[PDB]
Amino acid sequence: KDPNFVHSGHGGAVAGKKNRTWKNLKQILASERALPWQLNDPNYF
DNA sequence: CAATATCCCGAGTACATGCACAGGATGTATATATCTGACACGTGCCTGGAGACTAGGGAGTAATCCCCTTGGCGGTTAAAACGCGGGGGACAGCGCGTACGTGCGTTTAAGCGGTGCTAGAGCTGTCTACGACCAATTGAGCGGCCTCGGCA
């Protein structure tokens, strides 16, 4: 009936005290600024 | 002496208190723990002692009238007591906050290595501030010149 029930653990706060569902957008972006971008590349920031 | 008042004693009066009860949360109890700091050891400083001397101050006195102190002052209200007004006092209910419980997830503490901020260094090296002295100013009091009011 329903599409699925054995849903995967994508990243929620089961394993520790950290923020509940997932990182906020600012924290995501702080991890995107680490990548090997080059001077012509489109981006979100 | 009369009068308003405080004091005192017994009847009658709700509930307050001290108690008994169920039960729950925490104080105990044991074992373990490192580490606070106790204790022991010297380090080196100032707290103290101890002298010589001036000059600042302190103590003393003398003279005295300022200020306090007192009496007697004249003037007006806080108190006394009453009349007199409204206002502090005793019940019915709403629902809003406070509490309290749930699951909310933010941040701190800790232990990590790196490093630059600060706080003890100088004779730093001077020179603001510290006396030292001079000079200006105002004010006050004392002489001295000059119109006029009461007296011969």
Swiss-Prot record:
Proposed core component of the chromatin remodeling INO80 complex which is involved in transcriptional regulation, DNA replication and probably DNA repair. It comes from the Eukaryota. The keyword Ion transport does not apply. It is found in: Nucleus. This is INO80 complex subunit C. The chain holds residues 84 to 128 of 192 of the full protein. Component of the chromatin remodeling INO80 complex; specifically part of a complex module associated with the helicase ATP-binding and the helicase C-terminal domain of INO80. Component of some MLL1/MLL complex, at least composed of the core components KMT2A/MLL1, ASH2L, HCFC1/HCF1, WDR5 and RBBP5, as well as the facultative components BACC1, CHD8, E2F6, HSP70, INO80C, KANSL1, LAS1L, MAX, MCRS1, MGA, MYST1/MOF, PELP1, PHF20, PRP31, RING2, RUVB1/TIP49A, RUVB2/TIP49B, SENP3, TAF1, TAF4, TAF6, TAF7, TAF9 and TEX10. One of its GO terms (cellular component) is fibrillar center. GO terms for biological process: chromatin remodeling; DNA recombination; DNA repair; positive regulation of DNA repair; positive regulation of DNA-templated transcription; positive regulation of telomere maintenance in response to DNA damage; regulation of cell cycle; regulation of chromosome organization.
